[PDB]
Amino acid sequence: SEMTPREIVSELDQHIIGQADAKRAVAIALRNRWRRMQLQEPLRHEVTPKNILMIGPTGVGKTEIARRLAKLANAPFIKVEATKFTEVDSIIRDLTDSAMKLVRQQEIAKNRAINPEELKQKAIDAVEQNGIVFIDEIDKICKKGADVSREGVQRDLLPLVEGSTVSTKHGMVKTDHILFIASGAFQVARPSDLIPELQGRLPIRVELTALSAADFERILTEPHASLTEQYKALMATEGVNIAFTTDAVKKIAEAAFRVNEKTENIGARRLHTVMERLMDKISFSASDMNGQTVNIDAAYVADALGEVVENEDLSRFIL
Amino acid sequence: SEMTPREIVSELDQHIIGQADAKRAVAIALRNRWRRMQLQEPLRHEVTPKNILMIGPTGVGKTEIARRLAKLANAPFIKVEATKFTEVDSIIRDLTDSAMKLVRQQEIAKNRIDDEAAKLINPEELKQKAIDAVEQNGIVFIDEIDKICKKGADVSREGVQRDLLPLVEGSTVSTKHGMVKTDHILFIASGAFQVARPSDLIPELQGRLPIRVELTALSAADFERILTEPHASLTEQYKALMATEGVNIAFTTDAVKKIAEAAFRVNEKTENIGARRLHTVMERLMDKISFSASDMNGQTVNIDAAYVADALGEVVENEDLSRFIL
Amino acid sequence: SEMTPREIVSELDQHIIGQADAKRAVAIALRNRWRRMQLQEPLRHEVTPKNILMIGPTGVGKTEIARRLAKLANAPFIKVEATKFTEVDSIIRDLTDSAMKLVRQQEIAKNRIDDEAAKLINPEELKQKAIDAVEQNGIVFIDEIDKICKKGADVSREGVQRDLLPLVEGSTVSTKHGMVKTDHILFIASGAFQVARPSDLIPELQGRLPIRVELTALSAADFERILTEPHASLTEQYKALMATEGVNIAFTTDAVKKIAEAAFRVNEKTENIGARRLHTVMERLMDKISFSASDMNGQTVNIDAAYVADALGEVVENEDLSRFIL
Amino acid sequence: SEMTPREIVSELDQHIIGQADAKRAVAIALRNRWRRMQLQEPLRHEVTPKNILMIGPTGVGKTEIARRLAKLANAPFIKVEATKFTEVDSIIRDLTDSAMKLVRQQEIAKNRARINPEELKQKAIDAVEQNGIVFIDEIDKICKKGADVSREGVQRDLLPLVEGSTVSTKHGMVKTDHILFIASGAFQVARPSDLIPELQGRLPIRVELTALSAADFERILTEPHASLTEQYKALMATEGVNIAFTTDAVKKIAEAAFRVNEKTENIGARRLHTVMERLMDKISFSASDMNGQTVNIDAAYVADALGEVVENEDLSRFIL
Amino acid sequence: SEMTPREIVSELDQHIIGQADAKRAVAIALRNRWRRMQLQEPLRHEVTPKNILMIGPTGVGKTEIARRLAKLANAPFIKVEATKFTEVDSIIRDLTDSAMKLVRQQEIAKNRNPEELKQKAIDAVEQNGIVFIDEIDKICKKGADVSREGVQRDLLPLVEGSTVSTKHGMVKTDHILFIASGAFQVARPSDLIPELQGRLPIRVELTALSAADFERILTEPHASLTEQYKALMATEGVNIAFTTDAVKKIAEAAFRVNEKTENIGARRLHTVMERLMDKISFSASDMNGQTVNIDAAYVADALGEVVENEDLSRFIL
Ligand SMILES: Nc1ncnc2c1ncn2[C@@H]1O[C@H](COP(=O)(O)OP(=O)(O)OP(=O)(O)O)[C@@H](O)[C@H]1O
């Protein structure tokens, strides 16, 4: 009828490296969905979603985990920056909108081998029933004049979280049962700085960790459709056969990490950055470089990258 | 014909623990509705609702009591943040919209193949009836009104009050169903009022809110009860939830007593979020089982003080201190 | 053909206690309406309303008098805070809208299952008749105009005045029923004017508000009367309400004298909200009975000074002092 | 074909007392309209209105004169506070909206014999474009004297209109090119020479209006078609009372309005509507059951009904 | 096929007095239009307008020249205050709207169809539209300033060429000719954002209008003032005649004041005239048949002295 706690984490482990607690959290969450809606009418409607608040550094998974959860649950998903509102009902609106495309797409599948009404109500059903809403950087609309402008968005989100109704161009949808997942670094504010009303509709606090050299090494190759898995597949098209050696990855990764530490740690994005910086030349020539096989090793990588440029501060600003 | 003061309170006691004065308040209130509208035309329209202002701490019942009142009276209800307006007529608009659902759904079944049901309705009547619904027994719950009180940029708030007058005071607002009159809508306003006194609202309003009723902080002991008594209490819920995965669960008195003492415990030590703290502590305790409960079929978990005492781990506190003191 | 100066006052005396000059003012005013519109075309349109400005304390009648004047004249009425605009044409718009429900439910309950109703109507005429109603006998009450007076960010207010001129002064505004003209609407503006003088409004307006009339603070002795004289007074109402539950209630003179001396009492000690304070204290008194009156059938409660004195309790006041005093 | 400079003034003299130069200004102005539109195509469109800026005190005629001019010329008219904009195109919109009610108003008598909306509109549009009068009140306020560029902005905003542009109305496209504009203002702080040059020159005709005098009130009090006195008489008539104001009574009533205007907030001629309603107090109530009788309002009466004044409150309280 | 550089100046000379460099500039400009659009597809679209920035004092022709240029070219034309935006796409929108009328007014007399029209109108805009941005010097630089140096960034796309949606379809500012004007008494044109500063290649200056100049704008232009009053008083039956020395006087006068006070340029003639033709304009009605001989005496009278003297004193110690 549906996946299970441990069952879903597996699926998640397929695309995200590490960040366990988090995976579990959304798992037990997604699972409670099947549990309720399996209860009898009185409770089937009385029990409510156990919203999660993921705390963590930049780009280490919060979002993927969320987007994936939705994905493996074939659930209407939608992400929104909290600061985007410094019309909130739009969130639920957009969600429902997504809900159609979803239901619709999987309708022309059986209706190929219709009616408007059934669709809309069946999309609503989906929103109201299994919608995931991801509120990014909610830690930004926390507290720390012009502040009540932010501490306001919270009061503005309550009705959604807390359960209300918003009108969409497909009908009336109820936020009552939408699963919410709020994210944030919280380097300055504690989550215990949100308005109590919200602080309590965000029961599950889960933590995500900084990503390591060693970790990068993995995100670099394990994940279904990793970066290396991608370039290989991409240069392939041009006819070029490429191969990354262990030490090469180790190097690539030790490099991503290297800069993150020396400058603006942008988390795992730094891999997409270092990769494109490495796969630079080949990406161009790959075209008329048919047949060849590039053997990207530690030497290769160590060259393609060059020299880290740090210590710009000091001098210029110091006495 | 309709329930009664004491009668209604009973029904409320089913879902809210404590907060008596409050229950009564809304009870006498919902009762006066049946009393007028039982009077003769001159007065039937001359007498007006006795709106309520519930003063209290966070999540101790203010809203449930209202939401329930509405529910047990099958009345068009609607809640709105007071600060939401820092278009107010919307409140009445949304209300009417809800009365529709109520009045509609009230004739799609109780008064009676999916293509069956169309010209036997008369979509020219429903609305009218939906209006009456609103016009006659609408309950509006204005939350944290204490926030649009006083204490530049303040007149922006002391404004929402003047904006609400017309509703409370009695006016007409156009809805996509026609004209509805707030003249008889029952209004229930709520607020903590830790900074402002209710006697800080604009007099025009301060007198349209005649009934002042207080609600209490929720106690350890109180938690113990909200914990199990209420129709569909938390435990009553988890039990029902783990049931589905095949696990049979049971909470021992001492466990509840512990769970509660625990929620309370933290509330006092940090940000007292009222009863929400139970939903919080429960999800923290039911952690483990909630995962494994799936492949943990058949077994029966016996949640006792020991269990809880563990699942919750130790308390943290007074982070502050040091770092800010000399 | 219509009532008369002294004849209208009588009707007003039925619901308002005291506040005479005011009653007169709106009387002669309502009368002039019949006077013109009785004149020949040249003047029938040249002569304009003599708009009134009621200056008074809080809740002493300013609005009842207006709302009632309107009611006894079966005239489209509408009230608006002046500060509501710190779209003004909406005033006339909403007015026109009210003229519908008035005229509508006036050629349905007069000029007359719900199928023989589409007869006569002639929608394009109903409208053309409401527009007259507005244009001819509309009363617009502009509350707390003294607030949009003057005393930066002040021109925001001294602006709503310039914004109201065209209405007062006479112009046209488009309604969803057609074009209506403010030329003849009767305007009644009210305000306490504790800080600003009326002679602080913009001259343009200062002159279109010819009639100044003063209302008096409501006294203990006064309360005693608003408490029982007025058609459908408070006591008259409660009596009528407990009746329904089957309880027979009776207020002794000394009881009223007490209830009133009570309302006044607090009004003086705190935020004087005028007569609203009676609706307050009454509810605070009829507390118990209102609950139990249900299963308290047959009995008869005798509310005397003892009673009231009890049901109310003591008054709080010197909250101030201390804390902010050295 | 149309009235004349001296001919129109006559008509105006019928409702406004005094304020001559002004009447003339709008007269020559409404006349130039008939003059052009009588010329041949090249010029018929090349010559433009000679817009007026009336400078004056509060309520001494500026608007009546304008409202009336419009009226006597049966032209689409519209008045607007200049400060209302601190959507300007609305002016032309509302104007055109009026034209419609004005054309169609007279297109139901012509079509009484025994329509065609695609023409009607096309007509009101000609109406507006051809003889529209726009009255911009208190423009002296949007003059200059930060937050000031907010006002000196409305001017730049009005140019296109005054200067001649096109604005879309729900009846079609209309051209302000030929609309007649009359701007008014007290100008007690700013000189008209304070407006933006662009506008300072599209307001050629400067005409000044005078404060209203005791003597003047005496006249606004009885001469004007439908004067106040003429009105009350007409009003108490209905209740059956015959009333009569004696010369000296008028002289007194007026000396009185003036009196106060000088002593307090001079609101111009409105002060008469004020004093009249203050005097006609009593009678207005009792006139109802006072049938038959005849009240003889003389100097004594008025002197009574009015009482005494309050002329010197300040001092004290504020002075050391 | 179309007029020419020198050929257009002529036509302009007919309504504007002086301001030659200006006339030439729009001349070569309107001419370039015919030149391109005479080229072969690759270039017919590659070459773009050479936008003009006219710098000058108040009311000395900046706008007439432009409005006329447009007129004589039967082109969709539109003027806008630059500060009007302190929705910019409207300019192009309103322009299109205008071409619609210009394209109606022709297609109606031709016959003596929707699709064809809206499209046909659109080519008009896209192909020969003139947009006159006034007092752009105001949205130049000199906090709350980035609010102006913003309108520039807002105009770029138009000038620079983009597309905007009109209720008639999609139009492209790619080829619209833009003419911007401004006094520039405080800011230099070299103070606008570079992006724009390079899209306004042609800089042309207009001069202050002189006494002597006035004398001419006073009588030479088709439908000059005098020509106008004559024509107007004619209607009332009065025959009027201005004498040379009279015009010399009227003008000398206009100029006189401009110098002594708020120099509003040529408008000062519309001013002084109305001030002079005062009396006549009223009486002219029942003054039929007569003939008025407006000489220097007459003018010198009807105006009646006015030297500056206000300032100082009250403000000086
Ligand atoms: N542990 C990880 N496993 C797999 N992919 C990862 C991991 N961490 C980061 N990524 C990749 O890096 C990107 C991180 O996106 P994500 O938004 O989840 O970070 P975040 O912590 O949610 O950041 P923010 O809240 O600042 O947006 C994704 O493309 C993801 O595929």
Ligand SMILES: Nc1ncnc2c1ncn2[C@@H]1O[C@H](COP(=O)(O)OP(=O)(O)OP(=O)(O)O)[C@@H](O)[C@H]1O
């Ligand atoms: N005494 C109580 N008995 C039963 N349930 C309660 C009680 N107090 C709180 N709750 C539960 O805790 C939550 C309290 O939310 P609620 O909004 O009712 O509190 P509130 O005081 O009205 O809130 P706010 O602070 O937003 O006004 C609800 O889920 C309710 O079921």
Ligand SMILES: Nc1ncnc2c1ncn2[C@@H]1O[C@H](COP(=O)(O)OP(=O)(O)OP(=O)(O)O)[C@@H](O)[C@H]1O
């Ligand atoms: N003298 C009176 N006689 C009868 N009812 C009165 C009297 N004074 C007040 N009331 C009652 O008390 C309330 C007074 O409110 P009302 O709005 O009429 O006063 P107000 O002068 O308009 O106040 P505000 O200036 O604050 O609007 C009404 O409900 C009215 O029924």
Ligand SMILES: Nc1ncnc2c1ncn2[C@@H]1O[C@H](COP(=O)(O)OP(=O)(O)OP(=O)(O)O)[C@@H](O)[C@H]1O
């Ligand atoms: N000289 C006059 N003759 C006749 N009636 C007059 C005269 N002056 C004023 N009135 C009357 O008094 C009022 C004068 O107001 P008016 O419309 O003239 O304003 P205004 O003088 O233009 O002032 P502002 O522009 O400051 O509003 C009108 O009702 C008009 O009927």
Ligand SMILES: Nc1ncnc2c1ncn2[C@@H]1O[C@H](COP(=O)(O)OP(=O)(O)OP(=O)(O)O)[C@@H](O)[C@H]1O
């Ligand atoms: N050189 C001139 N020859 C003829 N007429 C002129 C001349 N200069 C100005 N005028 C007349 O004076 C008016 C000037 O308007 P114009 O729009 O040309 O001024 P501008 O210099 O563009 O002003 P702005 O400061 O608004 O840009 C027009 O009516 C025009 O006929």
